[PDB]
Symmetry: D3
């Protein structure tokens, strides 16, 4: 089902440190997307190495894993029609310098090395990231009281 | 006369149901546009059919009219320089998927059939829509205390 | 029947002029109260004299009526459990100096003669005020999609 | 770091709070205040967990309905840390009955009826210890130092 | 003139550091109070010793002066009816633990040693504090476009 | 600290921005973004200062009206610091003509006409150097380290 598409959203250590957890969740709630998974955690080096597995031979890999391990993250799963693509639009460009005002990165951060947030770039990546960060039983299913007013 | 241009804005039944009336009015107030007409109403079938005359031969027409009738709407008239054009920009693209963050549809909705809001697409359409939804006596004329700081 | 209690709320000419219409409506929406009636209007002298009948022999009466006539008002009807009592709490004390931060008057105004807003002081007053400002056909009945999550 | 500034409380967003889209707003209020996030999870509370949580109310006539309702929808379970989090957290939430809750508080701004009061907070430090231990495993609690700590506490 | 009463408001180093300058000014603007003085500065030890002159023989004096000198402050003057007393209400109790939700300290800080903000406790103190922190020519006089809608 | 992250820009809230109560909102947007406050003052700009600021437009037919208007009301003069503040500051402000400004930007959200466009920002680093030196004395610029610096810049 197209309306039941899901994406992985992670608030990075700098997003948590700068007090942006509430603001970010509010953006997704007000949009009409439904929360399915939410977790406050410190990501282990093993998990981060698997998450950034495509970049393991790149020279910035050690510093990237170290930084994402240096503070707690907020791992999330959101559900909705085209939530992967729309979620990325809501976040803005990965490089905050190119992010537009009104987007999460556009409003709240400056440098790409400290870009507060991550979102799945595709449905394929979403399935991989959700399975890696979340256990199946940590994902909650329910129907929003506003479902009929959000979707036809 | 250019600063006295008027447009019709309607908050659709899903906009009312999802509690977005105040948020939407705030957007137009803070911009500097002047409120002219405002009423909470259930639109009759005859009114809606006349409002969507250009779409009467479309396959969606019957369901579209029935839905706009399914719940109460907030009918509005706003005044300002290029209020028709800039009003549409503030609302965002008709399809919420193409609507940018910062716009009303971009921030608050997902699906085209549940796109919370309507705005006149032209000056000609605005004049027709205002006269259709509002009696002349319902439109209030006053001068904003900030007029000299909004316009030269 | 207790959850179906109704109150009259009016945004005064200074509330409209200072761009507080959206902010005020948002306060009632987010609380969980249901919009029943809403209209933008210039109140006639006859209507205002009847609205302030209990104050007709007061020295301020003439200037008070003239001022409420000097600019357009937003007349509203809201529905909910103890909406009359809690509505007054949300508005704050009649004198803004005694109004607490968090209330409408406490946050947004200074002087008693320019106190942005009116709310019915009793159920009896509410019924009189609603019938005075609104025709029965202008009051819209619908069920909020969140009704079961606001009330038992 | 002073031990007094490291007090913990349990805050839970109820099913109606989740349904009405208040999760982000509630978290924001604790964040902007200066309190630090320790635990956070999205969950459907099991009947066993709810029976143990409302153990003092087991003999009451509406106990069956209370457990059933709190099980009907998902909740957001949270642990927050700060100087007197328990006491001031209750102040931020407002009175349990929303009719007596003041504007500016969470219940005062966002809900109407006591049966649908969107949120819960520990009434005491003793209750906080019990509630955190019941709802969270020790591994789920994350300890970190806020970059603003020196500007929140002397 | 009662409407021309003025008070001194200072955002403390922790208020600046925690990014609250904008939020605080917004509170006073939306209330209807008029900005007359605004300055970003690092307060010298000489100025702080004179500001806290009544406490110079107390054992906490050295630490208090040192802290208020450790970071930049935002010094402000605001004008309005009973702005001194009302300003203090808007700030909330000096000890944030006793500050109510909706007030500046109630919403944004925790401990009295880091209470983000200061406001004059009396008209007498206001005159003394404004004269100490500001030069007469740094105070700007103008009339708000909304004056007639804020005051009778 | 990297020199690149220490770029400075001049931002001025115009008399209409002050009149319409947008001072707090504008400052908030720069604060929440992560940019650091360097200079801030409330002032009525003198005719001499405005003539030097708009020196490139001195021969234009509406120069007399422009100086007169900018002198009629008080302004908020600001200096902000951060990585590419000049460029991104302009993006945050939106297009000079508010008709072309996008929602989410300062001009896009809050104003309508080009003659009353509430705000100004330096168009280049060269302009920033000139504008800061003209509007501010070196003593008025305050240097401090943000507690969040390590979480804004690597």
């Amino acid at each position: 089902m197209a309306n039941c598409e899901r994406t992985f959203i992670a608030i990075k250590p700098d997003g948590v440190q700068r007090g942006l957890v509430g603001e970010i969740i509010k953006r997704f709630e007000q949009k009409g997307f439904r929360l399915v998974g939410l977790k406050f955690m410190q990501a282990s080096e093993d998990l981060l190495k698997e998450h950034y597995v495509d970049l393991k031979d790149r020279p910035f890999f050690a510093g990237l894993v170290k930084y994402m391990h240096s503070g707690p993250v907020v791992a999330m799963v959101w559900e909705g029609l085209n939530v992967v693509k729309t979620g990325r639009v809501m976040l803005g460009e990965t490089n905050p310098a190119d992010s537009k005002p009104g987007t999460i990165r556009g409003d709240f951060c400056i440098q790409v090395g400290r870009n507060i947030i991550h979102g799945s770039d595709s449905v394929e990546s979403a399935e991989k990231e959700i399975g890696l960060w979340f256990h199946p039983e940590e994902l909650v299913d329910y129907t929003s009281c506003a479902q009929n007013w959000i979707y036809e």
